[PDB]
Design a protein around this ligand. Structure first.
Ligand SMILES: [Br-]
Ligand SMILES: [Br-]
Ligand SMILES: [Br-]
Ligand SMILES: [Br-]
Ligand SMILES: [Br-]
Ligand SMILES: [Br-]
Ligand SMILES: [K+]
Ligand SMILES: [K+]
Ligand SMILES: [K+]
Ligand SMILES: [K+]
Ligand SMILES: [K+]
Ligand SMILES: [K+]
Ligand SMILES: [K+]
Ligand SMILES: [Mg+2]
Ligand SMILES: [Mg+2]
Ligand SMILES: [Mg+2]
Ligand SMILES: [Mg+2]
Ligand SMILES: [Mg+2]
Ligand SMILES: [Mg+2]
Ligand SMILES: [Mg+2]
Lengths: 252, 250, 250, 252, 250, 252
């Protein structure tokens, strides 16, 4: 028993992860069974509530990927309930300051390293009675860097011992820097900001991840040395596939 | 108006989506594409009645006609779906004239059928004039997917109150002793499919089929199918994800 | 005690609510009014089994007897509702003595019927003595809503184990070739309703009916109906909202 | 495509809205189809959770009213997830200070006018790819005035550019001022407070709304020049209608 | 591999859990204990299809084979459960050879049965080779719980495609005119149970039974039952809570 | 109509309560029907979301125990929505300071004693139109003491008028004091801390509760004079009962 993403990193390999915005277990299991190391459930920009995330985490684990959640907000009590429901990866949006990164770290570890409340319903079933001793290793925590403010604060954020590193939200970052909501961009200012965050993460001996909208862009990010790359949202892949089926059906 | 009936009345076939995943977000998103209808599969999916109800609403808001492929040809199940705003019904494994008569009985009020009266959602869409035009608001297709159905095709097509038939080519292939392959080239299955189509059109009825690709759907439209579905949500998403991963991993 | 049976044993009819909206808050709130029973409609509503279960609990806490009008006269569906704490069953479209016998078979343990034993919620309410008094805890009504049922009334009423019959006057009006109007004045429908009532009372059975207004319910109570429902939640809420809007907009 | 409430206001007309405390799609659609411009779903004083609100917003839009939510609390991340689920009106309870009104404004607009996170799942489907350019206009935001403290701070609250105005909670206001929980009151002190808030809202070129328990009271509020009037809660109208049916059924 | 079939192929019986409570947390937790299978009861529980679906996934992750005791022996209900990853089916009240043939028809693809093809979850577990080995992945047991079933035992056991029979001793006791007691000592019921066991083993079939205690389950295993369930989640939890309260209150 | 726990306390009797971590109504009703005065639903260390807690509160009340909730976090708006859903007992985890105890008190009372928002959907049905006058008595509020920090602050926490007292989280307390996650412990340091909290609660004329993992430990806590004792979690009792059934089934 081990965190599949931590196993990638311990073997000097990056992790590739899925991204779900659609509630339900069937597609969660089917995607987890593909060559994804993790599958992230998006609880920020989706209609997925806690009652719907709980059985999705089970389905991903059965499919053979590490269950991750991108939370609605950086809130310790929300993050703790997800950990106890068998979320083994947490990505907290809009972490703009060292203090906010400490708030995330506080949720991911038991005392004395954090203030995580004890009652691990699903981790105890997966890991057994030996869980508390290894609990910190079973969990991956990434602070999202999505703003001018987070970019300015990146060295202070990376100095927080309890987070594994940072996950870049490139569309919110492009918007905050005064651009359109650019997806998978080469825009020089946005790309220089993202390169800066990766360079500082690795200099600090921390991990860096990035959200991607396509397989093509994910290959570029992996080939730049990102540690955790997501591609691409279930609803986006499904809509694109339907549009293409319809286009081919209705062609002369 | 029933968007599929509007296609037909205007001399055009209908192209439909096919959902095996529960939920409203992809249902609305696919309904807003160039689909005339979106079918929710209650047979080969985890979708129960509590989940189908909001999906019907989402499809209608997206601007496609909501259809349901039911778990079974059962009149009371069909009547509850109709009153929940399912405006097309595809009933699996209709094998006999009696079974086609059971389907027709569910889709029409007395004296044409025995549909129980309590049209919760259709009354909201169509108003107090609903009863008079109820029959035309609903499209009903009996599924031809066995040797027995294929043997009994003319008598199934004889039943007034069904709009026509919808081929289940994987179940048909399997019952003919062939592999249940999507979009099959198997000569006997392809000949059985063309026979059902010709028989439906000769009886003044409509015919539909399930497809797994845009390419196959283009052929069935060209061959004169009236209602073509392509392709299942879970299949399309799985194949897309496989491609993304293969692109990403180089 | 079954509150409806207590009304009957004390020489009083029962007045019931009628829910087509899922959820527990209005179910408890209507149960706390001067209703003896609240019926949950699983036929002409979006309510599935997962939603009916907590509604039964809410009605019982509010202090009305929980009833269910099932989607269909199916023994296994009725048995699951009984074991979930439905203490009244109204089965739609009971047209023959055989169909009434199917309903009675579901409502009684061997040797009277064939009800499967596993009474999850009734055992909590009634304790370990439940089996001996099980029959008296449940009220079962066959719906008379077709020409065929009306023709077969005496033989439906002959079936021991059903408490009596419940008229579906909109389906009856429609099957008699009339408008399916709530609370109809149509002479033949009104005469058919009085006939069913007289036949039930002559057979020593109970009779109920669906009403759309307090005024009509008052008449049916005065005419000697034993179980009168008025009026559906969605209808009452819709008419109330229309009035509020008309008041507000001046 | 336009916000039906904003269209009323642009045409110098007030908006009349429904108020739901009962979960489910069928009554939501049926009421939306009546002569209501909007229907508000109450997530503060109801058992409605996020999983239940999501399909109700769809049902209201299909019925042809603008979907609104009265949120449980003034929390930016909760408000953002509702916007991305196709809530086009937000009413945030207990907004007592200018700082709290700024917190609400921050959630309702993308950078640089706010800090709303980008991922508009349902608005993108309703409005298309041209959504970001008009996003602020598609959304109506009202701060609730329900306390002595909010009343004292009304000019500071109204000075916040990012809110369309204020929505009065007359029962909580009556309670905070030391009265019984008065519904649709003429009580001189409560009525003078409410008149003050309307006068200051209109002086500031802002909109003012009020919650009503009856059609009669809603007519009075509309005829005083309120911009957004709700009447009346589904559970209240249903209970009153049932009581009257029973009273008529059991009459001699 | 089907874990129960693996027990049988290795000359061992299977011990199973029994859930009447909906939800995934206790389902996974009991599946991780020394149970070979966990049965979800859809007959005497509030569990609907929407709730059973995630429970099947939880049991499989816990490392027990997921089974379902269905509400009724209905082919379309069984086929939807199979496609949702129910790998054992126990059908209540199988009373005749015809009813056993109806069960067998649902569990096998043509030409052995008439199972409709669309194996959503089994295809994920078993891959594209699923069709060829489908029959062996599923365990099907007909319930013997009436006088009529007991009378028709040899002809039920004659049906190829059913793995064997599962005794419902409380319904059997009640239909024989005895108390529906868990783990009964009633001489005629005990003799009926041993007869069904001997008949199943003589026909080369498997036999199972429902138990209420570890002590009784130990005896049935020793007597040579192939599939023993003990004990229902709600019963075990209720008795445990009663003990805790009695300990606490002194 | 009365709070069953307050009735115990008014009659000089302690209350014994159940503890649910499993969603659903059937076991909630069955346990409520046993000799428990209350049943607590755990929304911190369970997968229970608001949509699942709502019908469980109904089931417990019908079974004839007082419905309690141990909340995910000490958040006033979450606590208010539970009160309006017919939670009549609130246990808020991780209350570490007098200020946090005041935050809990603020949620449990209407103005002027608190700032609870008015809209009591279920309490109004249970208690009728006379509810506001007795509302404070219908509700039991307990602040959880689970940390070194809460222990140091126990006299300041107990000085908050609006809480009935404190509920000890012995496992989180043992962890915070540097021990293993000890369940039902006699460990001298943890036991002295718990005895101190009980002694200070009773000296302050307040009530004290404690979570137990067994019937045996609950008897000891009752016999020490605790006012509110819980035993034992549904999932723990069910797992132990299954293990024993299996052990007996597979015995030689
Ligand atoms: Br792959
Ligand atoms: Br398109
Ligand atoms: Br009343
Ligand atoms: Br209107
Ligand atoms: Br074990
Ligand atoms: Br007890
Ligand atoms: K994988
Ligand atoms: K369309
Ligand atoms: K359901
Ligand atoms: K009552
Ligand atoms: K409207
Ligand atoms: K196991
Ligand atoms: K009790
Ligand atoms: Mg972002
Ligand atoms: Mg088929
Ligand atoms: Mg009817
Ligand atoms: Mg929920
Ligand atoms: Mg208020
Ligand atoms: Mg049985
Ligand atoms: Mg704790």
């Amino acid at each position: 028993h081990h965190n599949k993403v931590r196993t990638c990193w311990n073997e000097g390999r990056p992790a590739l992860a899925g991204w779900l915005q659609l509630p339900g277990t069937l597609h969660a299991e089917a995607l987890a069974r593909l060559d994804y190391d993790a599958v992230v459930i998006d609880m920020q920009h989706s209609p997925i509530d806690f009652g719907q995330v709980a059985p999705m985490l089970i389905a991903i684990e059965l499919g053979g990927a590490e269950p991750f959640v991108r939370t609605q907000v950086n809130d310790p009590s929300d993050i703790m309930k997800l950990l106890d429901a068998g979320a083994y990866g947490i990505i907290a949006p809009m972490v703009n300051t060292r203090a906010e990164a400490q708030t995330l770290a506080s949720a991911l570890h038991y005392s004395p390293r954090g203030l995580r409340s004890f009652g691990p319903r699903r981790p105890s079933l997966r890991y057994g009675s030996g869980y508390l001793a290894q609990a910190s290793e079973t969990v991956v925590g990434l602070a999202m860097i999505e703003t001018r403010e987070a970019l300015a604060n990146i060295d202070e954020i990376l100095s927080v011992d309890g987070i594994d590193g940072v996950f870049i939200g490139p569309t919110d970052l492009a918007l905050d820097l005064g651009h359109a909501p650019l997806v998978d961009t080469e825009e020089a200012e946005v790309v220089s900001a993202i390169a800066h965050v990766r360079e500082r993460a690795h200099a600090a001996g921390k991990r860096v991840g990035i959200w991607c909208g396509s397989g093509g862009f994910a290959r570029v990010k992996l080939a730049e040395g990102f540690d955790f790359v997501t591609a691409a949202p279930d609803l986006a892949m499904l809509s694109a596939a339907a549009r293409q089926v319809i286009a081919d059906a209705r062609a002369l």
